[PDB]
Amino acid sequence: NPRTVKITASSEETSGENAPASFASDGDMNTFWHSKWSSPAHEGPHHLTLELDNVYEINKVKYAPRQDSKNGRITGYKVSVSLDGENFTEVKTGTLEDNAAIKFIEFDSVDAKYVRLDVTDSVSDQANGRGKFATAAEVNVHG
Ligand SMILES: CC(=O)N[C@@H]1[C@@H](O)[C@H](O[C@@H]2O[C@H](CO)[C@H](O)[C@H](O)[C@H]2O[C@@H]2O[C@@H](C)[C@@H](O)[C@@H](O)[C@@H]2O)[C@@H](CO)O[C@@H]1O
């Protein structure tokens, strides 16, 4: 049940379309965060940090890909946790399948107030777009 106080990101798009980082902090499958693609683009590295309302014991991250485009779809991730928002500890690394299905990332129970998702790999419907974008309809945490 942890509440996301806020989501911050490496970057966000509010100019070419409305896709701020906070759109990834609700369960509307029809809104998403997009890394900044409009000039000047931020083309990586990409990440997203959820600040929880308290310290929780967490063992799972849910990731809902953007539903209308594969652009930015996360296929490689590192998950880290923090108590103070500054010092992070890696708890999980892995790949995710290249489809729009909801993903889960699971690890041993760990106390966190902040959960960071580093995008190590991402896909695109563009020929030379590997790694350029990051999108998320939702990122959430569970314990
Ligand atoms: C094959 C190919 O090159 N396709 C591109 C496609 O990737 C582009 O989509 C947009 O790309 C930017 C980043 O460059 C963002 O991801 C945009 O959200 C994305 O737009 C979305 O998809 C398109 C197809 C439209 O439905 C748009 O309204 C969506 O938001 C488009 C640019 O429109 O061009 C090529 O089709």
Ligand SMILES: [Ca+2]
């Ligand atoms: Ca959403």
